[PDB]
Every structure is written in C-alpha cells, then in structure tokens.
Design a protein around this motif. Structure first.
Motif, PDB file in Angstrom:
ATOM      1  N   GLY A  61      -3.418  50.239-102.615  1.00  0.00           N
ATOM      2  CA  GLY A  61      -2.355  49.304-102.301  1.00  0.00           C
ATOM      3  C   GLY A  61      -2.751  47.845-102.294  1.00  0.00           C
ATOM      4  O   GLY A  61      -2.136  47.033-101.598  1.00  0.00           O
ATOM      5  N   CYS A 149       0.343  57.311 -98.033  1.00  0.00           N
ATOM      6  CA  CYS A 149       1.003  56.022 -98.026  1.00  0.00           C
ATOM      7  C   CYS A 149      -0.119  55.019 -98.205  1.00  0.00           C
ATOM      8  O   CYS A 149      -1.003  54.923 -97.362  1.00  0.00           O
ATOM      9  CB  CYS A 149       1.712  55.779 -96.705  1.00  0.00           C
ATOM     10  SG  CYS A 149       2.614  54.220 -96.654  1.00  0.00           S
ATOM     11  N   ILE A 150      -0.112  54.306 -99.326  1.00  0.00           N
ATOM     12  CA  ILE A 150      -1.165  53.339 -99.619  1.00  0.00           C
ATOM     13  C   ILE A 150      -0.903  51.935 -99.073  1.00  0.00           C
ATOM     14  O   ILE A 150      -1.587  50.985 -99.440  1.00  0.00           O
ATOM     15  CB  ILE A 150      -1.437  53.256-101.128  1.00  0.00           C
ATOM     16  CG1 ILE A 150      -0.274  52.576-101.844  1.00  0.00           C
ATOM     17  CG2 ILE A 150      -1.660  54.646-101.690  1.00  0.00           C
ATOM     18  CD1 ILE A 150      -0.461  52.471-103.340  1.00  0.00           C
ATOM     19  N   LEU A 151       0.106  51.817 -98.218  1.00  0.00           N
ATOM     20  CA  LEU A 151       0.478  50.544 -97.618  1.00  0.00           C
ATOM     21  C   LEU A 151       0.607  49.398 -98.619  1.00  0.00           C
ATOM     22  O   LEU A 151       0.006  48.351 -98.425  1.00  0.00           O
ATOM     23  CB  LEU A 151      -0.517  50.167 -96.519  1.00  0.00           C
ATOM     24  CG  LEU A 151      -0.498  51.055 -95.276  1.00  0.00           C
ATOM     25  CD1 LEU A 151      -1.678  50.768 -94.367  1.00  0.00           C
ATOM     26  CD2 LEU A 151       0.805  50.887 -94.519  1.00  0.00           C
TER      27      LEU A 151
ATOM     28  N   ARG C  42      -8.599  49.355 -98.300  1.00  0.00           N
ATOM     29  CA  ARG C  42      -8.829  48.941 -99.678  1.00  0.00           C
ATOM     30  C   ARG C  42     -10.257  49.181-100.144  1.00  0.00           C
ATOM     31  O   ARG C  42     -10.558  48.912-101.312  1.00  0.00           O
ATOM     32  CB  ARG C  42      -8.473  47.467 -99.841  1.00  0.00           C
ATOM     33  CG  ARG C  42      -6.984  47.188 -99.905  1.00  0.00           C
ATOM     34  CD  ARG C  42      -6.408  46.998 -98.521  1.00  0.00           C
ATOM     35  NE  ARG C  42      -5.103  46.356 -98.543  1.00  0.00           N
ATOM     36  CZ  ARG C  42      -3.952  47.010 -98.500  1.00  0.00           C
ATOM     37  NH1 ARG C  42      -3.940  48.330 -98.432  1.00  0.00           N
ATOM     38  NH2 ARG C  42      -2.815  46.341 -98.520  1.00  0.00           N
ATOM     39  N   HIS C 133      -9.620  59.690 -99.221  1.00  0.00           N
ATOM     40  CA  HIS C 133      -8.519  58.861 -98.746  1.00  0.00           C
ATOM     41  C   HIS C 133      -8.116  59.275 -97.341  1.00  0.00           C
ATOM     42  O   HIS C 133      -7.986  58.436 -96.444  1.00  0.00           O
ATOM     43  CB  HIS C 133      -7.338  58.962 -99.709  1.00  0.00           C
ATOM     44  CG  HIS C 133      -6.102  58.270 -99.230  1.00  0.00           C
ATOM     45  ND1 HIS C 133      -5.880  56.924 -99.426  1.00  0.00           N
ATOM     46  CD2 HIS C 133      -5.019  58.736 -98.569  1.00  0.00           C
ATOM     47  CE1 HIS C 133      -4.711  56.594 -98.912  1.00  0.00           C
ATOM     48  NE2 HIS C 133      -4.170  57.672 -98.378  1.00  0.00           N
ATOM     49  N   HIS C 137      -8.592  57.191 -93.897  1.00  0.00           N
ATOM     50  CA  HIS C 137      -7.395  56.931 -93.115  1.00  0.00           C
ATOM     51  C   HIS C 137      -7.537  57.485 -91.708  1.00  0.00           C
ATOM     52  O   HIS C 137      -7.089  56.861 -90.748  1.00  0.00           O
ATOM     53  CB  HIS C 137      -6.176  57.513 -93.822  1.00  0.00           C
ATOM     54  CG  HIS C 137      -5.458  56.528 -94.686  1.00  0.00           C
ATOM     55  ND1 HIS C 137      -4.362  55.817 -94.251  1.00  0.00           N
ATOM     56  CD2 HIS C 137      -5.685  56.129 -95.958  1.00  0.00           C
ATOM     57  CE1 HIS C 137      -3.939  55.028 -95.221  1.00  0.00           C
ATOM     58  NE2 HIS C 137      -4.726  55.196 -96.268  1.00  0.00           N
TER      59      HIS C 137
END
Ligand SMILES: Cc1cc2nc3c(=O)[nH]c(=O)nc-3n(C[C@H](O)[C@H](O)[C@H](O)COP(=O)(O)OP(=O)(O)OC[C@H]3O[C@@H](n4cnc5c(N)ncnc54)[C@H](O)[C@@H]3O)c2cc1C
Ligand code: HEM
Ligand code: HEM
Ligand code: HEM
Ligand code: SF4
Ligand code: SF4
Ligand code: F3S
Ligand code: F3S
Ligand code: FES
Ligand code: NA
Lengths: 238, 114, 470, 105, 105, 114, 105, 119
Positions: A61, A149-151, C42, C133, C137
């Motif tokens: 994102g 959800c990659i914001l 990121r 991922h 997260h």
C-alpha cells in the motif's frame, strides 16, 4: 512516449497553494514502463519532486495514487491508462489529506481511525486447548478476505458517507478489521466490541454506497462486513 | 476533487433530496385537505387551486418525488432485510428497475393530472 | 546543542526481524524504541510469497534431529551448527507462541497447522500467499497491543564509537521533522539487512538503500562473507552474509591477531546478521525462521548482555561530530558530478564482474574500475537545494552506503580459490574442503581480508563429517 | 441510540407504505369523485383512524430523518439546534392541524 | 432500562385500578340504564377525560407487558419484532378509535 | 421434566394468560362501546349483541379474567410495596384469599349477566 | 440525561414566550370584547392549533420543572414518587381538558 | 491531575503558547478555604449530588490546560451527573471568594463545551 506531465503541485512549502508547473520529458515507445519508472526517469531533471514508494510489486500500500480522478496502485497502474485520446494526463496527489509533503501526505487521521477499533485478539484466559489452538477450516475458507487490507486508503477516501463527517465515521477497512477479529472463532469477546460500536452512530452512518468495492485495489469486500456486522448488532440491541 | 463516476452518489442523493421536498409536500397536502373539506364553498375552490398548470406541475412533482422516495426506501428495506443479494450486477440492475418503476409511478401522477 | 534522550534499547529497522526485537523489549518493560525508514507494514518483509518453515508434527513423525540433518545437508557443510542447534530446538516453541497471537495461519481439516513439501526430504509450511504479510501485521498489531512507541519515517546514518570502543546510541534524520537527533542507548540492534539495490535486476525493493552494512563498515565494524549472495532461480534475491554476531546477540570484532572479541554496545539480528544457517542454498524460510526465532532469542538474551556491559559514557559528545562532519561534507558540495551516474557505473561494474561468474583477470579489471570510481566519487553534485523536505537528500546519503557493501564482496573474490557453496568460479569450479572451511572477514580501516575459524557442531549430538555431494 | 433510530425508521416506513397504498388506491378507484363521496370516504372510522396514524408516524419518522440530515450537513451547532426546533414544531403542528381537520367532519 | 419499566407498570396500574373502580361502580349504581342515561353519563367532562386517560394508560402499560411476554417466549428475532409491531399498532389504534368514539358524542 | 407440585406456577401463569386475553378484551369493549354510542339505532343492536349466550359467556369471561388479573396485580403491588410479609404461610393464605375474592368478583359478572 | 432536560426547557420556553406574546396581545387589542368576538377569535385554525401547542409544551416543560423541585427539596423517596405521579396526571389532565374545551367550539 | 496516553509530540520539554497561560492565571491558586463551597445556595440542599465551584475550577484548569488531550471522557463523565447543571447561577461566591477567583467563568465555559458535545 515523448510526454508532458501536469501535476497538482511539486513543492508545498512555496508561498502559493496552487502550482501547475509544466513537467516535460522525452520517453521511448519500444519498451513499456510503469508510472514509477516515469518518476524514476523524471527525478533527475526536475529535482524538487518527492514520493513515497516501497516495493515495485504493489503489496504494501505504498503508492495508492488517485490520478486523473481514478485511484489505483501506482505499481499496478501503467501510463497507457492515462494517455487516452486527448491530452493532460493528471497524476495529482490523493484526496482530503494534509498538505505536509508533495505526495507522501499524512495519514495520522486515517491510521488513527484504524487504531480506534482495537485490532488485536484478546483471551480472558481459559486455555480450552493445551498446545495449539482449535479451529475448523470452515472459518478459514470464509476468513480469506479480511487479513490483506494493505492500507492504501483508496476505499476510505472513496466513501461518500465518510466525507462530510470525517471523525465520526469508521471507514470500510476500519470495519474489515473489526469483522476479522469478530468471526475469527479464536476469540470470545464479541459483545463488548459490538456494544462499543453500537453506541457510536459510526456503523450506521453508512448509506450503502458500495462504490468502494469496485475501487478496491485488492478486490476486498467491505460491504460484506457492513452486512454481517449490522445483522449481528441489530440482533443484540433489538 | 472531481471523480466523474459517482454512480451510487446520484442514486443516493436522490433519496435525501426527495425526502427534503416530501417533508414540505406533506404540509402542502395537509393545507389542501384542510381548505378542501371545510365545506362545499371550498371544494370547488380547492379543485380551482388544483387547476393552475403551475400547481399541477407542483402536485405531479410532489407525487413523483414521493414515488422515488418510496421505491428507494423499499430497496433500502429489502436489501437490509437480507432478502436481496449483494454484488455489482445486483446494484446496477436494481438501479435500472427502480428507475423504470419510478418513471412508471410518475406516469401515474401524470394520468391523475390528465 | 543537539537534544538527546536517554534510552535502554533502540532498534534499526521496524518489521521482519525488528518487530520481534522491539516486542520482546516491550515485554521486558524498561523502554523499547522503534526507529525505521518507512511505515512498518511497508517493509520489504511484506513481500511474503513463501511460508514459515518449522516442524510441529504432521500425521507422520518429525524430530529435530531430521531438522538438523536436512538443514545441514542443505548448507553444504560450511558453517557451525550451534545456531542450527538452537534453531532446530527452539523453533516450534516460538512459532506456536506466535500462533497464539491469533496469527491467521491456514489449518488442516482436523484443526492443525498446514504443511507442504519443498526441496529435500517433510516440513515447509505456509499460511497463504500472504504468510509473512500476516506475520508482520500480527507483530504490528501486538505493537499496538503493548503500545510500543514507533518512530517511523526517519533514518539512521551512523552509530557512535567512543575511545575505548563502545556504542551508546544512534543518530537520526527524518522526513516528517528532517532534523537530526541522537537516541543514546547501550543496546543498538542493527537488524535492517539487504543490499541488492546496488545491482540492476533483483527481487529486492528500493527502500533497501543498503544501510545495515553502511553504518557498520563506515563506523568501522567488520563483516563476514559479504559475497554469500543468493540469486533466486536467475534473479538475485538474498544476502547470506552480513554483520557478525552469536546466537545470543552481541556482534564480534578482531584484534591484530584475529581473535573474535565481543563488541561493546552493538547487536544484530535479521537477514543482515549472518550465522550462515543459510549458506549455499538457504533452507526455505530460514531467513524468515531467522527473524522469528533468532529474534525471540535476542529478546530472551537481554539481561545476560546488559549485565556485563552497562553504565558506560559518551565520547565527550565529540563522536557525534563524525556523522556531523559527514553531514557537513554534505553541506560542502554545490556542483560536480551527479550521484546518479556514479551509481550507474557501479551497478554496471558489479553486476558485470561479481555475479555468479567472477573471472580472475576481469576480476582485477573490475577491481581497479570500481576502485578508480571510488577515488573520483568524492566530488558529487547535488540535485536538490530544498531546505524543508525532499527525497533526494536521503538518496544522496544512500550512495555513500550502497557502494560500500559491494566493495566487500569484490574484495572477497580475491580470498577464495575455489567454488564453495553459492560462490562459483570459472577458473576454479570445484569445491576444496581443506583450506577455507572457515569464514572470511573484511577489516574496514585497513580494508583488508582475513579468516575466522568455525567449529564442527559440538553441542549435544555426535558430529558428522562433510559428505560428498551425490 | 442508533439501532433505536434504525428500527423506528424501518417500522414507521412499513406503516407509511401500507397507508399510501390504501389512500392512492382509493384515488384509483375514485370513479368520478364528488363532494358527497369525498366526505363519504372520509367520515368513516377506518379512514379517520388511519389518517391520524399516518400523520403521527410521519412525525416519528421525519423527526429522525431531519435529525440525520442536520447532523451530517449543517455544521455550526447553534444553527442546527434552532433548525431542529423549527422542524419539530413543524411536525407537531402538522399532526395537530390534522386533528382539527379530520375530527371536525 | 428495567426500573423504568417497573415504575411505569406499577403507576399505570394504579390509575387503571381507580378507573375500573369508578366505571364498574357506575355499572353497579346503574338502576335501569337507558340510552338517555347512557349518553348522559358519557357526555360529561369527568367521564370523557377519565376514559381517554384510561386508554392512554392501557397503551403505556400493555406495551411493556407484551414486550416482556415476547422477550421471554417467542425466540426467533424477526418474528418477535414484527409481532411487537402488530401489537403496538393495535394499542395506538385502540387509543385513536377511542378518540373518534368519545369526542363524537 | 415433571415436578408434580408447581403451586406457584399455576398462580403465576394465571397472570400472563389473563393479561393476554384482557389485551384483546379491551379491543372487544372498544368495539362494543363504538357500535353502541353511535346512535339509538345501535344501542338496542348493541344490547342485541349483548344478548346471545355465547356472547354472554364471553363477556362474563372477559370480566372474570379481568378480575383475576386485577387481584393478582394488587398482590404483586402490595407484596412489593413491602406492605405484605414473606413466608410460606403468607403465600398459601394469599393464594386462598385471592382465589376466593376472584370467584367473588366473578359472581359479580354473573349477576350482571342475570 | 441533564442536557436533554436543559434543551427541552429552553426550547419550550421559546414557544411559550411566543404564545403569551400573541395571546395577551390579543387581550391588548381587544377593544370591547364580546361573546361574538370571543368565539370569533377562538374558532379560528390559528388560535386552536396554537393553544393546543401551548398546553402540550406546558406539559413537556413543567414536568421537568417539578421533577427538579421534587428532586431538590422533598427528601423521602416514596413521597416524592407519589407526588410526581399526582403532578404528571395533573399535566396530562390539563392537556386533555384543553382538547375537550377547544375542539368543542 | 493530568494524563498523557503516551504520544510524545515533543522530546525534551512541553510545547505551549503563553496565550494559554495568560488565561490560566485564575485556576491554580484555589487555597481550599471552603468559603465559596459553603456559600453556594444550590449546593446546600443536595450536599452530595453537587460538585461545588472549586471542584469545577479544578476541572476547568485540567481542561483548558492545552497540555492534555483527554477532554471528552471527563466531559461526558460530568455530563451524566446533574451536578454541572444543579447550578442556578447564584454567583454570590465570587464576591465571597478570598482570592478573588472566578468560578462563574468555569461554570460558563464548561457548560458551553458540554452543551456543544451532547447536543
Ligand atoms: C517470493 C518470496 C520467497 C521467499 N523465499 C524465501 C526463502 O526461500 N527463504 C528465506 O529465508 N526467506 C525467503 N523469503 C523472505 C524474504 O526474501 C527475506 O528473506 C525476509 O523477508 C527477510 O526479512 P528481514 O526481517 O530479515 O528484513 P526486513 O524486516 O525487511 O528488514 C528491513 C527493516 O528495516 C527497515 N529499514 C529499511 N531501510 C532502512 C534504513 N535505511 N535504515 C534503517 N532501517 C531501515 C524497514 O522498514 C524494515 O523495518 C521470501 C520472500 C518472498 C516474497
Ligand atoms: C410519505 C411521507 C414521508 C416522509 C415525510 C418521509 C420522511 C423522510 C425524510 C425527510 C427522509 C430523509 C431524511 C433521512 O431520513 O435521512 C427519509 C428517509 C427515509 N425514508 Fe422516508 N418519508 C416518507 C415516506 C417514506 C416511505 C413511504 C418509505 C417507504 C419505505 C420511506 C422510507 C425511507 C427510508 C428507508 C429512509 C432512510 C434512508 C435514508 O437514510 O435516506 N419514506 N424519510
Ligand atoms: C384493564 C386492562 C389491563 C390491561 C390491558 C393490562 C395489560 C397487562 C398485560 C397484558 C400483562 C401481562 C404482560 C406482562 O405485563 O407481563 C400485564 C401485567 C400486569 N398487570 Fe396489567 N393490564 C390491565 C389491568 C391491570 C390492572 C387493573 C392491574 C392492577 C394493579 C394490573 C396489574 C398488572 C401487573 C402488576 C402486571 C405485572 C405482573 C406480571 O408480570 O405478570 N393490570 N398487564
Ligand atoms: C406559562 C406557563 C409556565 C409554566 C407552567 C412553567 C413551568 C415552570 C416551573 C413550575 C418552573 C419551576 C420549576 C423548575 O423548572 O425548576 C419553571 C422554570 C423555568 N421557567 Fe417556566 N413555566 C411557564 C412559563 C415560562 C416562560 C414564558 C418562560 C420564558 C422563558 C419560562 C422560563 C423558565 C425557565 C428558564 C425555567 C428554569 C429556570 C429555573 O430553574 O428556575 N417559563 N417553569
Ligand atoms: S480499498 Fe481495500 S486494499 Fe485499499 S486500503 Fe481499503 S481495504 Fe485496503
Ligand atoms: S472561594 Fe476561592 S479561594 Fe476560597 S476555597 Fe473556593 S476557590 Fe478557593
Ligand atoms: S460506508 Fe459507504 S462506501 Fe461502501 S463500505 Fe460502507 S457503503
Ligand atoms: S453553584 Fe451557584 S454559588 Fe456560583 S459557582 Fe455556581 S452559581
Ligand atoms: S511500492 Fe510498495 S506497495 Fe507499491
Ligand atoms: Na548481509
């Protein structure tokens, strides 16, 4: 292709608010490129540019750019989709965000809105299992649309209901997180989160716009979350 | 600022605009019922006021906006009852059919006018 | 003049290996800083199309002895297994401890962890396409849980080194503030990793400006085999080497003789920190397994390290003048040559003469090429005069970092007369196992190369000799 | 709260739907309306009670409706408050006028 | 909440007790009721106001009553909700019919 | 499942059953008052409908159930006012006396019928 | 809550101010009132609706008023509760009598 | 007392423009002499339900001291109790105050803000 570029403003700290300077460069036709390659090629002539890029594969994102009025992932969105018949490709920065830098604008409001939903598990402490958790994959096959959800803030800035009241609402992905930590069977704290969300008119502030689903970069379903969480909430407080 | 493709926005705004105008409609119709029923001396009077083409335009508009509001309201009702399924094609087909039946109910008002 | 704040733990990097470190320092409780360059999610770790790998028990039996057997037959018998010992004995514990965080890992119809096969003989798991991922997260969501105070969108340009030779903090230059600060702290964990930016085509991302070796080497911290570089099959993908350390965390230096000595005030975990448990061909996800379990160990080994070294001093606030004068030299260049061209030529030379093929004649040719380019590099012009903020500035600094890493690899091509592991040579295709059964070592100030011996895996199991690859 | 509002809106919309159906159905089956027939179809019980019920439900519905409008759009607080006062008096005046005009026939 | 309900039930039962006492007391002291006397005892103020008060209190009481019944017994939620709608419209129709039948005399 | 001694259950159920039937009673009596008062043309009509022995059975039942409800309601009222004391003997004696006065008020309805 | 009460008091006092202004203004411009003129100025719509609105607002206002008085002064709880019951029935009887006396003219 | 959730917008020292301090000079010297508190007509009849003038000067102090960000919780915790509004604007206390402090001012701005929230 030898191309002119026209952007919102390439330096915010300048006294004036608008700045539509003429970007210019000469590009090739015999090799495709993507928008970030345009940035790479330009950055050595017009020096005062800036941008927030990470991965060149579009998974974190980084650059969810809304160019020409349509949003997308800058590492998924090439230039041909901008050089349609006519002129003046438009790659202005994103909407409704603080002008603190050219294109890496602030998201404090956005990330904070995500934060206010308590997006993490909680176990009161019962240990029904001993070594590993117990969950039937019937959950996982219906959990495959929440934990990516990659914001990129495409859907959030694209909700008509959310605009007028930026602080009172919760946004689509802010509800995808709630739903994720809701129907993940490995918790048992549904009621407190539900009646904490029930209080605020945030859940219902939705007018079922549903545009965001089309606009989503990952092809996620916030509408589904808005459906089941409304059903459950209604069921509780009726 | 401009997005150029607010397909849902037009469908949605048409709901609150119609609500806001129907809210004053109901007052106009309470007035019309009042001034009518009071005696015979008013009934023709009332129909007299039901006469002018400005007034006819209004009343047809009152009832058309009302029909739009009713229909979209039902969609919000049934769609949230869970009786309707969610997808893009369902949304666009609901837009189509609701708009068609809105114009249909509109025509009913026109028939009343004529 | 520079404002300073006293801390007990700072971390150079946010996600991947770093999330683990800051989380364990949070559950420690004293204080747990978190510096980075980009917003946590990121991080390069988010590219995650490969699952974590740890044996928890399929329908069949799987013991840690088979774990060691396969993870050593994979490494082509080049490195010590003390770290392999700790890994194969503590992996399952840490992976299940993460699975209790609600980490969305895909299960099997009974309700147990899913397992799939990879190269060699029975456990290479996976959650989805987004396994790491979910890993990042969940570590970020636990960062929120314990309210760890992230300091995102900043940079670390160099560390501090006093007279007696210790590290007591790190400098920083931001993009939201863009003003240098100093976080003074005895624990500075270089857990950033990655250098592939110095090459043309590779799997890596551009946020990897090659810093974990930049500050290290520039500050004068040695490194171990910066040429162990895996090219994913035919695109470069991993930096096997990096800063030296041990299973318990502290980095290592050498004297004039070459004896390994604990460095005061430095730490390292993550793909940068090398213990060669990946070697020729990394085991599927043993850099992932590195960042998880080696980091869990880096957390569980905090009190043992701070107790022997603590209550030190700063270099009379005169060492911050090192990076200060670096930034002054930045305040020197007005015009000259564009750094872009320098990077172009360097990238070209290195991908030309230091990839899978390194030919001796052309090896020395590229050596003198990159050497003359290094000499002439000093006068570089600056494309941006902006006072408040830009990108270019950090770009400028990343040059003085990027190139340095490549340097080491180049030098090491002069220190290995065979094709050992991933390292390959046309003039030397075979793999000798009598001379260089030991790691290399680049001495920064002398820019030289030496060797460092390796143990033959005695911890709890009768050792086995290097077999023939057949 | 908010689900309170939700349920009141849905339910009173149900009653309103039934109303408009019945009333404009009578308009349909009018067949040459006359004063005689007009006062006829109004003086009933059924019509009287159903019309008072309709106006009451419009009160309880449009109140929350305009509350939502004026909490989403009109930003200043003193304004929005006096505006809601005007609108709520409008609704209660609607229902009382309704009284004086249906229980006079 | 719940004490709100408790107090409304007790109080409106007090008013209802007083009512039934008075009304069936008149039935007692009827002494050969006639149309004349029937319309006589109804056209008063006292009777008119007390009967409207009675029907209103029956509304405010039986509402909570059937709420308790249909939250204890009828388990499915969609059912119970529509059932309460039917019953609440029943009560409000009761009071409005009461109007049309007492303020017509 | 079976307990064979629900002394309180019968006393209690008789409360909600009577409430549920009185709730429709009030509607029947609103109808009866309406159809009666409209004019003389209905009064005898109304008494005519007050006539049939099915209807008489009903109305007596309406008023008997009403009396039961009123009495038990008073017990719930006074017992929770704190004006009545709690014990087994008080409960059984309240059951006795309430049932007796319920039949007494019932007889009143019978007298009205006759 | 408490701001609910605050706002209802202020708003209904606004409507009451407008009322007393209008009504005692008519008393001012009376100019030899007569039965004829008295029933004249009452039989209107405007007067009828505005008087019913006034009595309703007095209900919704004085309720909270006496609630405040009897929560500040009369200390015993059973007393204060029955006292509020008497006063609330007083207000609702006020509005219903108002009905029977304005929609009779 | 203050409360910081933990954000550290500054590093070494807090950040506040003296425009606050020139309007904060009438709250942090309540000497607790109980003159105003015992002198409030509204507070008497209900001694426990009210909050008193200085009990509100403290709230206002920790409210418009910009160095906090926890306004809403304190506000809607005070909103619940009828304590804020139990005031009938007696205003006698100001004359009776030993320090010449303004509780009426606190009663004004806190009512304004509270009204603004819960309207
Ligand atoms: C398709 C695919 C296949 C893979 N296969 C394998 C495999 O076979 N084996 C294996 O072991 N792994 C594999 N991986 C994992 C991956 O290749 C890496 O090995 C792993 O992600 C390393 O993560 P890390 O924690 O060590 O580094 P990171 O967590 O990425 O370290 C970077 C951190 O430092 C921060 N940072 C960035 N720049 C700076 C700077 N200048 N200064 C300070 N901090 C900075 C970043 O924000 C981030 O927090 C695979 C991944 C993918 C996508
Ligand atoms: C006939 C007179 C009507 C009036 C005075 C009225 C009042 C209003 C108004 C003003 C609105 C817009 C304000 C808002 O609620 O956001 C609204 C919304 C709504 N109306 Fe009505 N309405 C009427 C008829 C109907 C009917 C017949 C229905 C049938 C279902 C209906 C369904 C709805 C629904 C579901 C909403 C909420 C949807 C939204 O937020 O826009 N309305 N009502
Ligand atoms: C005359 C018409 C009446 C109607 C329409 C009515 C309505 C109802 C109904 C339907 C119930 C059962 C539902 C429930 O509340 O749980 C109930 C309960 C109750 N009734 Fe009435 N009632 C009437 C008369 C009375 C009277 C005169 C009293 C006198 C005190 C009374 C006292 C009570 C009490 C105390 C309860 C609650 C006890 C319980 O939970 O069963 N009722 N009411
Ligand atoms: C005409 C009939 C009126 C009635 C029956 C009535 C009712 C009451 C009563 C009994 C009180 C004292 C109890 C209390 O609220 O603490 C009160 C207070 C109040 N009245 Fe009225 N009032 C009337 C007229 C007005 C008018 C015209 C205004 C004009 C603004 C007004 C403004 C107020 C205010 C602001 C209060 C609260 C102040 C306080 O706490 O003493 N009242 N009302
Ligand atoms: S639109 Fe989808 S992918 Fe983009 S930020 Fe929202 S949830 Fe994430
Ligand atoms: S009157 Fe003033 S000085 Fe005295 S206690 Fe109260 S606030 Fe303090
Ligand atoms: S807020 Fe609106 S944009 Fe979609 S996700 Fe909900 S309907
Ligand atoms: S409570 Fe009364 S005494 Fe003054 S400070 Fe407030 S008006
Ligand atoms: S560059 Fe990281 S998401 Fe596109
Ligand atoms: Na390395």
């Amino acid at each position: 292709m030898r191309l002119e570029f026209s952007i919102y403003r390439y330096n915010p700290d300048v006294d004036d608010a608008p700045r539509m300077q003429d970007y210019t460069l000469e590009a090739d036709e015999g090799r495709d490129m993507m928008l970030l390659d345009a940035l790479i090629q330009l950055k050595e002539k017009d020096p005062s540019l800036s941008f927030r890029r990470s991965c060149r594969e579009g998974v974190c994102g980084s650059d969810g750019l809304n160019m020409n009025g349509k949003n997308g992932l800058a590492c998924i969105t090439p230039i041909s989709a901008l050089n349609q018949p006519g002129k003046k490709i438009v790659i202005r920065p994103l909407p409704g965000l603080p002008v603190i830098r050219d294109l890496v604008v602030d998201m404090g409001q956005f990330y904070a809105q995500y934060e206010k939903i308590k997006p993490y598990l909680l176990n009161n402490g019962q240990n029904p299992p001993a070594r590993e958790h117990l969950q039937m994959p019937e959950q996982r096959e219906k959990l495959d649309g929440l934990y990516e959800c990659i914001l990129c803030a495409c859907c959030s800035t694209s909700c008509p209901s959310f605009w007028w009241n930026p602080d009172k609402f919760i946004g689509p992905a802010g509800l995808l997180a709630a739903y994720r930590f809701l129907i993940d069977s490995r918790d048992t704290e549904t009621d407190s989160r539900l009646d904490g969300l029930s209080d605020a008119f945030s859940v219902f502030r939705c007018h079922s716009i549903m545009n965001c689903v089309s606009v989503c970069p990952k092809g996620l379903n916030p509408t589904r979350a808005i459906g089941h969480i409304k059903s459950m909430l209604l069921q509780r407080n009726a | 600022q401009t997005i150029r493709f607010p397909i849902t926005a037009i469908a949605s705004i048409l709901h609150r605009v119609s609500g806001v105008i129907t809210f004053v409609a109901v007052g106009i119709l309470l007035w019309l019922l009042g001034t009518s029923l009071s005696s015979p001396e008013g009934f023709e009077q009332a129909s007299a006021i039901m006469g002018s083409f400005f007034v006819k335009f209004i009343m047809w508009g009152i009832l058309t906006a009302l029909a739009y509001h009713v229909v979209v309201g039902i969609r919000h009702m049934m769609m949230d009852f869970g009786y309707l399924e969610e997808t893009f094609e369902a949304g666009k087909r609901s837009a189509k059919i609701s708009f068609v039946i809105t114009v249909v109910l509109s025509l009913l008002a026109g028939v009343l006018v004529w | 003049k520079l404002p300073v704040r006293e801390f007990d733990a700072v971390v150079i990097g946010a996600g991947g290996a770093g999330m683990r470190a800051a989380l364990q320092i949070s559950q420690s409780g004293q204080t747990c800083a978190l510096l980075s360059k980009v917003f946590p999610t990121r991080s390069h770790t988010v590219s995650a199309q490969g699952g974590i790998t740890v044996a928890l028990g399929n329908t069949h039996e799987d013991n840690w002895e088979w774990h060691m057997y396969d993870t050593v037959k994979g490494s082509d018998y080049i490195g010590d297994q003390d770290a392999i010992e700790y890994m194969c004995k503590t992996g399952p514990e840490a992976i299940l401890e993460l699975e209790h965080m609600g980490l969305p890992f895909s299960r099997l119809d009974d309700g147990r962890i899913y397992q799939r096969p990879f190269g060699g003989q029975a456990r290479t798991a996976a959650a989805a396409d987004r396994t790491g991922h979910a890993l990042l997260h969940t570590l970020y969501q636990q960062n929120l849980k314990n309210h760890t105070t992230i300091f995102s969108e900043w940079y670390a340009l160099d560390l501090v080194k006093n007279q007696d030779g210790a590290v007591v903090g790190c400098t920083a230059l931001c993009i939201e503030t863009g003003e240098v600060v100093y976080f003074k702290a005895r624990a500075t964990v270089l857990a950033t990793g990655g250098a592939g930016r110095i090459y043309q085509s590779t799997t890596n991302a551009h946020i990897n400006t090659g810093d974990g070796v930049g500050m290290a080497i520039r500050a004068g911290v040695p490194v171990q085999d910066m040429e162990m570089w895996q090219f994913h099959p035919p695109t470069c993908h991993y930096m096997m080497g990096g800063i030296p350390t041990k299973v318990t965390g502290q980095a290592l230096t050498v004297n004039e003789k070459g004896e390994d000595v604990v460095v005061p005030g430095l730490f390292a975990v993550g793909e940068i920190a090398c213990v060669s448990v990946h070697g020729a061909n990394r085991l599927g996800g043993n850099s992932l397994l590195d960042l998880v379990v080696f980091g869990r160990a880096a957390g569980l080994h905090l009190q043992e390290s701070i107790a022997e070294q603590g209550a030190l001093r700063d270099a009379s606030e005169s060492d911050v003048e090192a990076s200060l004068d670096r930034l002054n030299r930045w305040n020197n260049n007005r015009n000259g040559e564009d750094p872009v061209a320098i990077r172009k030529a360097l990238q070209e030379c290195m991908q030309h003469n230091f990839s899978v093929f390194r030919e001796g004649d052309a090896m020395a040719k590229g050596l003198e090429q990159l050497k003359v380019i290094r000499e002439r590099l000093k006068n570089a012009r600056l494309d941006d005069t902006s006072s408040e903020f830009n990108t270019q500035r950090v770009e400028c600094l990343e040059l003085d970092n990027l190139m340095e890493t490549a340097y080491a690899t180049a030098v090491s091509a002069n220190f290995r007369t065979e094709s050992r592991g991933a390292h390959s040579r046309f003039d030397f295709p075979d793999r000798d196992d009598e001379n260089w059964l030991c790691h290399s070592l680049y001495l920064p100030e002398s820019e030289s190369m030496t060797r460092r011996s390796v143990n033959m895996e005695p911890k709890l199991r009768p050792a086995f000799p290097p077999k023939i690859r057949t | 709260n908010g689900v309170h509002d939700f349920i009141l809106v849905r339910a009173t919309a149900i009653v309103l739907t039934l109303y408009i159906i019945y009333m404009v159905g009578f308009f349909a089956t009018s067949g040459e309306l006359t004063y005689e027939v007009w006062i006829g179809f109004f003086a009933s019980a059924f019509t009287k009670v159903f019309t008072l019920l309709a106006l009451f439900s419009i009160l309880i519905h449009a109140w929350i409706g305009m509350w939502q409008v004026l909490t989403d759009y009109v930003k200043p607080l003193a304004l929005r408050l006096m505006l809601q006062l005007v609108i709520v008096v409008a609704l209660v005046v609607y229902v009382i006028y309704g009284f004086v005009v249906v229980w006079g026939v």
